[PDB]
Request: fold
Amino acid sequence: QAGLTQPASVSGSPGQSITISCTGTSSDVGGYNYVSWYQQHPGKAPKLMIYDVSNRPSGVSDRFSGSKSGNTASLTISGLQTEDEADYYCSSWTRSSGLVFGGGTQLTVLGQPKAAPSVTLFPPSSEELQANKATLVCLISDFYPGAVTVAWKADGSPVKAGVETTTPSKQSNNKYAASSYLSLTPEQWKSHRSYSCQVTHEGSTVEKTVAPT
Amino acid sequence: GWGDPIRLRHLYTSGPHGLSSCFLRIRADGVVDCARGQSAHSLLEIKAVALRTVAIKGVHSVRYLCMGADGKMQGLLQYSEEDCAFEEEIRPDGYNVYRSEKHRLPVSLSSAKQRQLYKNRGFLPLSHFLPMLPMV
Amino acid sequence: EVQLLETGGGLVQPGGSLRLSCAASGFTFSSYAMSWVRQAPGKGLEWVSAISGSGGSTYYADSVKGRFTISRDNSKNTLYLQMNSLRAEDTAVYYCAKDNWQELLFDYWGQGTLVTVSSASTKGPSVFPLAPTAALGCLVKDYFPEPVTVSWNSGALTSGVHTFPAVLQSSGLYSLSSVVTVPSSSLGTQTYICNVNHKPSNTKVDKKAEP
Reply:
């Protein structure tokens, strides 16, 4: 009653080799020899890269190889090339549950140095608060690679109510950006001493505060 | 029936002890021989008959792959479990072997002379197969 | 070569109904099984349902049994998925996938058709200014559907303008921000204005961003 488990992210530099794991159960990966791997580039349909654990359809580069041990299937890409950057989904046959997929793995081919994110936090407008509304706008830009986590805290107390954050997306300069919005009522904006937006990127946390002024 | 997958494959072997690359072809006359490339009569349908046991039918010849005495491969229109069902065993290196339990021999494209030369070796030439997808 | 053309995607409200079609061309459609595989935006792949090739056998996932119906007609080479009792979780791009035979192994894919299940009606954005090398911008809040256009000072200012992608909030409406980082001396000299455009609601607004 559960999908297969893939790592969320795998990354290597050009020329390097990587492996993407795909853990299942004795009823799927460990019960048959029908593990498939699909490659999906942004905005396009999936492409069959590996079938029956280790076999390649015609045209697929021999840098892709599949294997399996117990309940864990693995896709290995040797000599990473830039175009290998995509999402990779493993799939397995099941007896009574159809085709079950893994959660997918984003493969990054590092073609840029690690860049810390720039963060600008905005307080609620005068016009919006006069309109009985309050929104704090936290905008994260110019970070590489494209993965961040945002945590909103009011004067140190963590808050998850009314929080919506966008998934990171590539700007024009190959760096990635994301946005964070905290929707509050007027008076809970005016009730705390400060509001702060923290974003953690590659273990390092960047923070910005604002005050009711 | 969605209990087990119906596979459509070309079976391809280059060894062991092989000379050329062979696609298993089932001709309309029942003869099973080496094909140098993917053809209509080398297109096989693979369905399970037990857990690890397999039946192989050429789609255009509609003949099942059946093994005779001393390991001879022929195409018969009437399926028989003892002659046309094989345990599919996938080797760690990725090649597939199809053992016959009745005849105690693997499916192979070896000649009659090769099958007699190797009958006491524990392996037959041209018995390690790669399953290939058909190109439309 | 082989082509699968999905049609019928669009906006439908929760509880509604919609039928998708897939135009198969370039192969003997009657000989191969088919499947529908869907992908929620920014999420993973999920296999929906399968059809036998002749129509005799159908296969469904737990999340769509009773609500979705897989069907085919081999004369016209077309695959169907009739989606009823649609929920928000069915929001996804729906792919038409050809089976290699009857093994749930997918030779060819269509380009997919998007099915959006939302209860949000067309709404224009409320545009608020974001007051402040200093950064100021414009908040484009609670509009539907996409897209909106943003230009600063009639497009005369392109230096350092980043208009972020839109966030979809729990309400079902989109929000967006666009910022310009400016020299910290020109805050008392020159006006910095955004012009937001939302054609679906026929909305065009100006707003002034100042300390």
Q: What stands out?
A: The helical segments of chain B are 81-84, 112-117.
